[PDB]
Design an enzyme around this catalytic site. Sequence first.
Site, PDB file in Angstrom:
ATOM      1  N   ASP A  35       0.778  -1.225   0.000  1.00 27.21           N
ATOM      2  CA  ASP A  35       0.000   0.000   0.000  1.00 27.21           C
ATOM      3  C   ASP A  35       0.817   1.287   0.000  1.00 27.21           C
ATOM      4  O   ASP A  35       1.284   1.723   1.063  1.00 27.21           O
ATOM      5  CB  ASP A  35      -0.952  -0.054   1.218  1.00 27.21           C
ATOM      6  CG  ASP A  35      -1.953   1.074   1.325  1.00 27.21           C
ATOM      7  OD1 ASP A  35      -2.106   1.820   0.354  1.00 27.21           O
ATOM      8  OD2 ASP A  35      -2.581   1.201   2.382  1.00 27.21           O
ATOM      9  N   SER A 199      -0.875  15.627 -12.420  1.00 24.08           N
ATOM     10  CA  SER A 199      -1.125  15.155 -13.780  1.00 24.08           C
ATOM     11  C   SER A 199      -1.411  16.387 -14.665  1.00 24.08           C
ATOM     12  O   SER A 199      -2.038  17.357 -14.217  1.00 24.08           O
ATOM     13  CB  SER A 199      -2.261  14.131 -13.799  1.00 24.08           C
ATOM     14  OG  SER A 199      -2.701  13.833 -15.116  1.00 24.08           O
TER      15      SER A 199
END
Length: 330
Positions: A35, A199
Amino acid sequence: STGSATTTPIDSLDDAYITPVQIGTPAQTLNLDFDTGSSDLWVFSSETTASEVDGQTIYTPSKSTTAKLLSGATWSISYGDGSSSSGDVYTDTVSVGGLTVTGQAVESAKKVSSSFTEDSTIDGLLGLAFSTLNTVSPTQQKTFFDNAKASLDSPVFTADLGYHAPGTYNFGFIDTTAYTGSITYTAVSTKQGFWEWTSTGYAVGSGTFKSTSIDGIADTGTTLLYLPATVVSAYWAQVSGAKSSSSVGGYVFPCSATLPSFTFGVGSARIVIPGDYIDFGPISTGSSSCFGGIQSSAGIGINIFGDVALKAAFVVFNGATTPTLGFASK
């Protein structure tokens, strides 16, 4: 030194990926969920409440010659999905694909929420976010990656997740045969303790790319892709019959529909997620309504590039002094 381990989807939908990890001496092998959205290494153990264990392999510190109780230390964690766990802490030897760390904090779960109990294939989590998110009190502990960093040939780990297939987690090296083209690196902000990056935009199917900044985290522990409402509405408007359902808790679409691809930007590079990766199958067995892999982040407060996005790329987690994330096509 280096390490290399195979990670396998737990089911036919790629809901989660498990990777075998050896804890203790002699080794006890547990299947952990790697994780990058958390920083605690916690396992089901001989101390977990017997009613909260349903088929998991448990860690037994009494059978390990290298286990030591970390006197007074406790932990308590709550995840974004509402799930939770808590207990005490041991130190022990932990190895991942041949890479060994001595004195790793192993958080023994005394109590686990129903969500973990239900998942019989997952024995625990191995946190790979920054050590500042670790929940051990009063003395904060380091992640497996942070402890191994000095011994690694390069301070990196890579995630190469498969679509309905096994993949690989590598530590300390970059496999130049696992990707095509070049790796595009992007800056990471460690301010919230996550692998947070920006992004540069998106495109839906064969539509034109829209340049817009989308801040989010690279999270291997989250199954889906969670993006702002504006982006998610633009995607689902291209699927006939798709709608957001309050009963289901997200976007659903007719199982007969074909899903367009989703492209996200990394600097000047583009990563294309095939439409098939966005199909999460019927909401219930036999249902003609299918669950979408792209959902709104509005109720969460953070955009998450989960397994849906990550499995479409070869991803480098560079834990150098100036951390970066690298993405390549594969």
